[PDB]
A paper describes a structure:
Dopamine receptors belong to the GPCR superfamily and are divided into two subfamilies on the basis of sequence similarity and pharmacological profiles. In contrast, D2-like receptors (DRD2, DRD3, and DRD4) activate Gαi/o proteins to diminish cAMP levels as well as modulate certain ion channels. DRD2 is arguably one of the most well-established drug targets in neurology and psychiatry. For instance, most receptor-based antiparkinsonian drugs work via stimulating the DRD2, whereas all FDA approved antipsychotics are well-known DRD2 antagonists or partial agonists.
To obtain structural insights into the unique ligand-binding pocket of DRD2, the same T4 lysozyme (T4L) insertion construct as the one previously engineered to obtain DRD2/risperidone complex structure was used. We eventually obtained the crystal structure of the DRD2/haloperidol complex at a resolution of 3.1 Å. Comparison of the DRD2/haloperidol and DRD2/risperidone crystal structures reveals an overall 1.5–2 Å binding pocket compaction with an outward shift of the extracellular tip of TM1 and an inward shift of the extracellular tip of TM2. The volume of EBP in the haloperidol-bound structure is significantly reduced when compared to that of the risperidone-bound structure. This is likely due to the more compact positions of TM2 and TM7 around the ligand in the haloperidol-bound DRD2 structure, and the inward rotation of EBP key residues: Glu952.65 and Tyr4087.35. Notably, the conserved residue Trp100EL1 in DRD2/haloperidol structure rotates outward away from the binding pocket as compared to the risperidone-bound structure. The outward rotation of Trp100EL1 in the haloperidol complex allows the formation of a SEBP, which is occupied by the chlorobenzene moiety of haloperidol. This rearranged DRD2 SEBP consists of residues from TM2, TM3, EL1, and EL2 and is defined by Trp100EL1 and Phe1103.28. The mutation of Phe1103.28 to Ala or Leu on DRD2 greatly enhanced the binding of haloperidol or L-741626 (15.33 or 1.77-fold for haloperidol and 144.18 or 18.65-fold for L-741626), while the mutation of Phe1103.28 to Trp or Tyr greatly reduced the binding of haloperidol and L-741626 (28.00 or 41.41-fold for haloperidol and 8.51 or 57.54-fold for L-741626). The ligand in DRD2 is located deeper in the OBP and embeds in the deep binding pocket defined by the side chains of TM3, TM5, and TM6, which accommodates the butyrophenone moiety of haloperidol and benzisoxazole moiety of risperidone.
Author numbering: 35 to 139, 144 to 382, 387 to 463
Write the structure that this text describes.
């Protein structure tokens, strides 16, 4: 009916979005990065689906059954599985290239490496698909490989779940790595402002503290003050701590500071509103003056919530807080405006996009392999009317990816507008 015309334009927008991505990467040196090279390899898998495969899927909707040779169906199924597996194996290499960038310290060596990855993606995609042409070691095929009971079991495990687990395990490791550095930079930030002390010392208000504003005990008794420290370290403090031990002590101070921020009605919303780095600045304030003290200049706090970065910085400089510790105030206020650690970077934003495509990829195809589980779980025969929608939802992912590139990235965005105009 009229539904055939929607899909052919879906094929057209898949080609529209991806042909842009390929040229845009090779057009500008600023987008010629390891990850973006792996991204065009993903774009080529999304193009070959739209050109080699999706046309036969639309005829199958139009006509309503195969109505072509058995071997044509084998080729069509083999190639359909092959290009979707390239899509998955490309996400896997993208995540791995994101692991290396955040976790490892690279000119000609990057091009020679990415090359090796891309070569693995397609060769393996192919070698995984070759069984479908030779009837999954089942001779007298006598039928399109789709009809083999093992087909859904082979294609689901080998081409989806197993690449899905690995890519997910990498992203977890990436999250852990970024989490250690984010906590590393906080400690490093307050080491610069408060100062790191490794011998027990009387603080401003008289009580004995150590490291970065960690009071051992409100009660002043030196041997008793050692006492609380000894509980913390486990070794005989003897009033002596390592940088490391202080940091371990520091991350505890941060975690306590944060629960109080969320338990504070004046600071819960604004903390929730801010980004990771800007949150480290707000932590710096609570460390310096206390949540009740930071909870003041609500007037200034509204601006940080309203994303008014420039106007919050103008209003913060007006304070007494600036007058007492101007250098520290200016440093922190930059981090509030800049939202970066320049006062005291590139790949954390880029790695957020990588996971974002790997996530919408999964949600786009997830229901398709869900339904296939239900039939294998012998559940009430799943209506085909839905079964077809889930196929296209999976194929829709080919058109969403170039939309995500331009959405969450300025460089693809600018490279795109240059080609059109
Ligand atoms: O493999 C797939 C999804 C099935 C594609 N493909 C849809 C059409 C199909 O359902 C079909 C139906 C009827 C006929 Cl006749 C031929 C083919 C065969 C399977 C895949 C998806 C995501 C991924 F990360 C890895 C692999
Ligand atoms: C081919 C399918 C691959 C499936 C991959 C699934 C990935 C899901 C997304 C993210 C979960 C882990 C967090 C990723 C790190 C993000 C960095 C950060 O914001 O700290
Ligand atoms: C079935 C899941 C397997 C996932 C594989 C996905 C493809 C990309 C992954 C790995 C290739 C890594 C090659 C790196 C070579 C480095 C050589 C060098 O340092 O020059
Ligand atoms: C089932 C998953 C198996 C593969 C895991 C994928 C993640 C990491 C992949 C491989 C490790 C890459 C190491 C490259 C070694 C090159 C050494 C060299 O030549 O200097
Ligand atoms: C058994 C499941 C396997 C899961 C492995 C994936 C989890 C680890 C995360 C990423 C590994 C990336 C390694 C890339 C390093 C390249 C340099 C080198 O290997 O010498």
């Amino acid at each position: 009916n009229y539904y055939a015309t929607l899909l052919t334009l879906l094929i057209a927008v898949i080609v529209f979005g991806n042909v842009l991505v390929c040229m845009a990467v090779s057009r500008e040196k600023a987008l010629q990065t390891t990850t973006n090279y792996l991204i065009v390899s993903l774009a080529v898998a999304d193009l070959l689906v739209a050109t080699l495969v999706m046309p036969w899927v639309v005829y199958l909707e139009v006509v309503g059954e195969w109505k072509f040779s058995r071997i044509h169906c084998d080729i069509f199924v083999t190639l359909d599985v092959m290009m979707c597996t390239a899509s998955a194996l490309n996400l896997c290499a993208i995540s791995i290239d994101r692991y290396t960038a955040v976790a490892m310290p690279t000119r000609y060596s990057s091009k020679r490496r990415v090359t090796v990855m891309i070569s693995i993606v397609w060769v393996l995609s192919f070698t995984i698909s070759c069984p479908l042409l030779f009837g999954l070691n089942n001779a007298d095929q006598n039928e399109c490989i789709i009809a083999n009971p093992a087909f859904v079991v082979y294609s689901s495990i080998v081409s989806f779940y197993v690449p899905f687990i690995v890519t997910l395990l990498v992203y977890i490791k990436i999250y852990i790595v970024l989490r250690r550095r984010r906590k590393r930079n906080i400690f490093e930030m307050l080491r610069i402002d408060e100062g790191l002390r490794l011998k027990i010392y009387k603080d401003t208000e008289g009580y004995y503290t150590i490291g970065i504003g960690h009071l051992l005990t409100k009660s002043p008794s030196l041997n008793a003050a050692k006492s609380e420290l000894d509980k913390a370290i486990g070794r005989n403090t003897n009033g002596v701590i390592t940088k490391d031990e202080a940091e371990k002590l520091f991350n505890q101070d941060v975690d306590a500071a944060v629960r109080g921020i969320l338990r504070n009605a004046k600071l819960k919303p604004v903390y929730d509103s801010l980004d990771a780095v800007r949150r480290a600045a707000l932590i710096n304030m609570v460390f310096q003056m206390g949540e009740t003290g930071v909870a003041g200049f609500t007037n200034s706090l509204r601006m940080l919530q309203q994303k008014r970065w420039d106007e919050a910085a103008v209003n913060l400089a007006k304070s007494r807080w600036y007058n007492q510790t101007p250098n520290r105030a200016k440093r922190v206020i930059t981090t509030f405006r800049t939202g970066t650690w320049d006062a005291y970077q590139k790949e954390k934003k880029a790695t957020q996009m990588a996971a974002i495509v790997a996530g919408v990829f999964i949600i786009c195809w997830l229901p398709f392999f869900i339904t296939h589980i239900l039939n294998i779980h012998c559940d009430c025969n799943i209506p085909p009317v839905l079964y077809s929608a889930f196929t296209w939802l999976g194929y829709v992912n080919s058109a969403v990816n170039p939309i995500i590139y331009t959405t969450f990235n300025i460089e693809f965005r600018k490279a795109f507008l240059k080609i059109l105009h």
